[PDB]
Write a protein that binds this ligand. Structure first.
Ligand SMILES: *C/C=C(C)/C=C/C=C(C)/C=C/C1=C(C)CCCC1(C)C
Ligand SMILES: CCCCCCCC/C=C\CCCCCCCC(=O)O
Ligand SMILES: CCCCCCCC/C=C\CCCCCCCC(=O)O
Ligand SMILES: CCCCCCCC/C=C\CCCCCCCC(=O)O
Ligand SMILES: CCCCCCCC/C=C\CCCCCCCC(=O)O
Ligand SMILES: CCCCCCCC/C=C\CCCCCCCC(=O)O
Ligand SMILES: CCCCCCCC/C=C\CCCCCCCC(=O)O
Ligand SMILES: CCCCCCCC/C=C\CCCCCCCC(=O)O
Ligand SMILES: [Cl-]
Ligand SMILES: [Cl-]
Length: 264
């Protein structure tokens, strides 16, 4: 049901996608160790924001690892090209993983925005419901990326509605709570918003690839887009969230944070 299954791949195409996914694994697990060691410099009220980046690194890292092994399982070099065998490859498992990872990305944002208690719980609940609506309708949509492009488009429009409303909640909370933020991170959090708008928008672009480039090179392009998007939305994002967490920790008087920033 996925366009990947439609084509044979050149050694070049096949190896590049393998390398993309493998590099993706390496980057996320390398970052995991960074987030782990810096977590001790985060104040208690923000420390979970950095823990969530650890959780996202392993979750994303595992899905990329799974995709890479699925990729090599599904194809074998036969008569001069990589051809589909008995096992299958699908991006559908990425969608399932987003059900977990996207709530984590959203929660660590709410934490460094200094949201608490009732507002935190209510905002998280609405954000996660919006995200799940987006992910589920998008998942259904890509089931038709071969059989019914029109259906892919309509489910994609519905998904985009959830996406836009989710982003509006995000932007509203960010620009409203920006003033509460310490250590100059009121400025930093603005860049985080735009990083999110940019990186997360790469995913619906990848989703539309079967509509504007239905060939083996389109398959490569989609994995390339996912790689840019994953690294930007999880790793670079997590680094900014953790920076913001440490800076606010220091400004709030957390001594290990102050000491850590002092060494650099
Ligand atoms: C780390 C993974 C992330 C941040 C994934 C984000 C995914 C999206 C923003 C997905 C968006 C979609 C649309 C807005 C329309 C097409 C269907 C989706 C689900 C790909
Ligand atoms: C930086 C270099 C990126 C690697 C290019 C791989 C594409 C190829 O070799 O076919
Ligand atoms: C934050 C950005 C992260 C970027 C991650 C991607 C790094 C590698 C990117 C690709 C370089 C272009 C490779 C050339 C493609 C050759 C075409 C092919 O062989 O199929
Ligand atoms: C392989 C990676 C090993 C990582 C172990 C690092 C332990 C961190 C110690 C700590 O800060 O609590
Ligand atoms: C095949 C029917 C798909 C139904 C989509 C349900 C939308 C989910 C909304 C928020 C949870
Ligand atoms: C909750 C939203 C559920 C779906 C809204 C209906 C519009 C998209 C469904 C397309 C159905 C189809 O194309 O067969
Ligand atoms: C051409 C790859 C980069 C595309 C970035 C634009 C999409 C996000 C816009 C906000
Ligand atoms: C080419 C440009 C690629 C961008 C690479 C991003 C790298 C890591 C981002 C680190 C986040 C630090 C927050 C900003 C620090 C500060 O505000 O002074
Ligand atoms: Cl604290
Ligand atoms: Cl993920």
């Amino acid at each position: 049901k996925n366009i990947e299954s439609l084509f044979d791949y050149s050694a070049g195409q096949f190896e590049f996608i393998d390398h993309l996914l493998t590099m993706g694994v390496g980057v996320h697990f390398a970052a995991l160790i960074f987030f782990l060691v810096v977590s001790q410099f985060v104040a208690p009220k923000y420390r979970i924001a950095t823990a969530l980046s650890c959780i996202v690194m392993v979750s994303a890292g595992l899905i990329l690892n799974s995709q890479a092994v699925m990729w090599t399982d599904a194809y074998a070099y036969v008569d001069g090209s990589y051809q589909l065998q008995d096992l299958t490859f699908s991006n559908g498992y990425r969608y399932v993983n987003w059900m977990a990872t996207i709530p984590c990305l959203l929660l660590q944002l709410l934490i460094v925005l200094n949201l608490k208690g009732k507002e935190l719980f209510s905002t998280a609940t609405w954000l996660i419901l919006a995200a799940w609506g987006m992910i589920i309708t998008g998942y259904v949509g890509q089931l038709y990326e071969v059989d019914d492009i029109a259906q892919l488009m309509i489910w994609g429009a519905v998904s985009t509605a959830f996406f836009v409303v989710m982003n509006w909640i995000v932007g509203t909370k960010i620009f409203k709570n920006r003033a509460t933020m310490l250590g100059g991170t009121d400025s930093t959090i603005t860049k985080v918003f735009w990083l999110m708008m940019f990186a997360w928008t790469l995913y619906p672009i990848a989703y539309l690839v079967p509509a504007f480039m239905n060939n083996a090179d389109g398959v490569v392009l989609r994995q390339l887009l996912f790689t840019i998007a994953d690294i930007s939305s999880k790793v670079i994002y997590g680094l900014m969230i953790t920076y913001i967490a440490i800076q606010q920790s220091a400004a709030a008087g957390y001594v290990p944070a102050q000491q850590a920033l002092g060494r650099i």
